[PDB]
Amino acid sequence: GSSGSSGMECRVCGDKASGFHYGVHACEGCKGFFRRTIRMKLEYEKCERSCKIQKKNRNKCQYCRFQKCLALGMSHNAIRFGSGPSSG
Numbered sequence: 001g002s003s004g005s006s007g008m009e010c011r012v013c014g015d016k017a018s019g020f021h022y023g024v025h026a027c028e029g030c031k032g033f034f035r036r037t038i039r040m041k042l043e044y045e046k047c048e049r050s051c052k053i054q055k056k057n058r059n060k061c062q063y064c065r066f067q068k069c070l071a072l073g074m075s076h077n078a079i080r081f082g083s084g085p086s087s088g
């Protein structure tokens with residue numbers, strides 16, 4: 001098909017977006033990564049190369065990926081909302 005598209009598309013990678021997520025319309029894939037990096041509080045080394053998160057190559061760079069999310073304006077102080085009761 002590879003035909004045109006009439007709707008919303010991810011802002012991180014580009015692939016069709018699932019909907020409004022953290023202010024930015026991200027897809028299931030990207031979204032997952034972001035949240036994960038938060039809930040897990042994982043860190044990454046500064047990637048000077050400043051790779052470019054694209055659909056064809058999404059799982060290319062980690063740092064850049066997480067960065068792009070922040071640049072777009074991904075709300076980090078939102079993850080904490082309606083969650084299962086876990087050992088506090």
Ligand SMILES: [Zn+2]
Nearest residue numbers: 010013027030
């Ligand atoms: Zn995406």
Ligand SMILES: [Zn+2]
Nearest residue numbers: 047051061064
């Ligand atoms: Zn990179």
